[PDB]
Paper text:
The PARP enzymes share a common catalytic domain, in which an ADP-ribose moiety from NAD+ is transferred onto acceptor nuclear proteins, such as histones and PARP itself. In both PARP1 and PARP2 the DNA-binding domain regulates enzymatic activity as a direct response to DNA damage. Here, we present the structures of the catalytic domain of human PARP1 and PARP2 (catPARP1 and catPARP2) in complex with BMN 673, the most potent PARP inhibitor reported to date.
A 62 kDa PARP2 enzyme, although structurally distinct, also has a DNA-binding domain and exhibits the highest degree of homology in the catalytic domain to that of PARP1. Extensive structural similarities of the catalytic domain of PARP2 to that of PARP1 were confirmed by the reported structures. The fluoro-substituent on the tricyclic core of BMN 673 packs against Ala464 and Lys469 located on the walls surrounding the pocket. When bound to PARP2, a methyl group of the triazole moiety of BMN 673 points towards Gln332 on the N-terminal helical bundle; in PARP1, the same methyl group faces the highly mobile Glu763, which assumes various side-chain conformations among the noncrystallographic symmetry-related molecules. Also located on the N-terminal helical bundle, the PARP2-specific Ser328 is near the fluorophenyl substituent of BMN 673; in PARP1, the highly flexible Gln759 with multiple side-chain configurations occupies the corresponding position.
Residue numbers in the entry: 234 to 292, 296 to 350, 355 to 579
């Protein structure tokens, strides 16, 4: 490759990192190594999670259900009683875990070699990654957007743009809902473990067997107009301060705008093309710009005056599309997190 693209590839294709990351989520790799991971294993996971969600919707069976889960998706809690899976946060953790294994299952297949390995990993992605000049117009806007939509309540770090690549995933230009109005350039963040999957298969909706209570606005692909909302889903740390952020063209269409969580939001569409969870603070439109016919919601964020008298109010917006054909990957940011 070019060196910058080589180091990116190195970075995301590091299986030792993937292993470290999974141990950090308390997954037992000694017992179920990542190289012995299969689609069937991971479905078995979902099927046992579904059975747990069932017990929370209904009311004993939960101990049977949690055990089956831990049998099929081994964990490592050491000498402590393995905890039960009982709260919304807990179940959503288990889903973040399984998603991640699916992306690793994918990476491990892909990183197998027959050319230099890094050049092989790269080719098998089927997605052009192109480093951009830091003096260029596109880098200017992206930096401004990165910083200017850093949310005031994600004050625990800053981000530094280390490097920028334009992304072009085979298939996407053509599949894309070019026709839909309301097209915006929006963020997506994810665990480092997941990039080989996302680059090679694209952003995907939730797995079919995934429990729906995990998903605030149902099983779509989620985006923010607030860089740090997305960046939080990188799960970076002082120990692992290099992450990646995605910018994608998102064909939003008419938005069904929602004040609070509804996992059945997808059936609420009834003609519309996306869900938008309304936030307290959002970038203001007097400040937007256009990059290749996609609106870029430049910061800073302002009180939108939005309020949910019924309960919890979102701090910042989110957008959910329920078909990959509404997403076109566009730029990938290499970001240093400064804690
Ligand atoms: C954890 N996860 N797995 C796939 N997608 C995600 C999240 C997400 N990933 N990345 C983003 O940029 C994002 C931007 C949002 F405004 C909102 C988001 C996300 N919510 C998604 C979410 C959060 C909790 C949950 F239980 C399920 C889904």
């Amino acid at each position: 490759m070019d060196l910058r693209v080589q180091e990116l590839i190195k970075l995301i294709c590091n299986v030792q990192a993937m292993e470290e990351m999974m141990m950090e989520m308390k997954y037992n790799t000694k017992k179920a190594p990542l190289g012995k991971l299969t689609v069937a294993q991971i479905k078995a996971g979902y099927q046992s999670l579904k059975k747990i969600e069932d017990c929370i919707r209904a009311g004993r069976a939960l101990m049977e259900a949690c055990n089956e889960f831990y049998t099929r998706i081994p964990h490592d809690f050491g000498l402590r009683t393995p905890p039960l899976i009982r709260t919304q946060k807990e179940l959503s953790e288990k889903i973040q875990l399984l998603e991640a294994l699916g992306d690793i299952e994918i990476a491990i297949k892909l990183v197998k070699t027959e050319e230099h390995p890094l050049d092989q990993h790269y080719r098998n992605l089927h997605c052009a990654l192109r480093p951009l000049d830091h003096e260029s117009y596109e880098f200017k806007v992206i930096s401004q957007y990165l910083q200017s939509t850093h949310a005031p309540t994600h004050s625990d770090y800053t981000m530094t743009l280390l490097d920028l690549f334009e992304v072009e995933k085979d298939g996407e230009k053509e599949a894309f809902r070019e026709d839909l109005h309301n097209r915006m350039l929006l963020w997506h963040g994810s665990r480092m473990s997941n990039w080989v999957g996302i680059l090679s298969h694209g952003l995907r909706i939730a797995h079919p067997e995934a429990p729906i209570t995990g998903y605030m606005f149902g099983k779509g692909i989620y985006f923010a107009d607030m860089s740090s909302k997305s960046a939080n889903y990188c799960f970076a740390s002082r120990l692992k301060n290099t992450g990646l952020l995605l910018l994608s063209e998102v064909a939003l269409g008419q938005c069904n705008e929602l004040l609070e969580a509804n996992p059945k939001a997808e059936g609420l569409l009834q003609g519309k093309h996306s869900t938008k969870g309304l936030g307290k603070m959002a970038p203001s439109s007097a400040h937007f710009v256009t990059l290749n016919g996609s609106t870029v919601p430049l910061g800073p964020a302002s009180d939108t005056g939005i309020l949910n008298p019924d309960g919890y109010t979102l701090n910042y917006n989110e957008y959910i599309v329920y078909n990959p054909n509404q997403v076109r990957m566009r730029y990938l940011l290499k970001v240093q997190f400064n804690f």
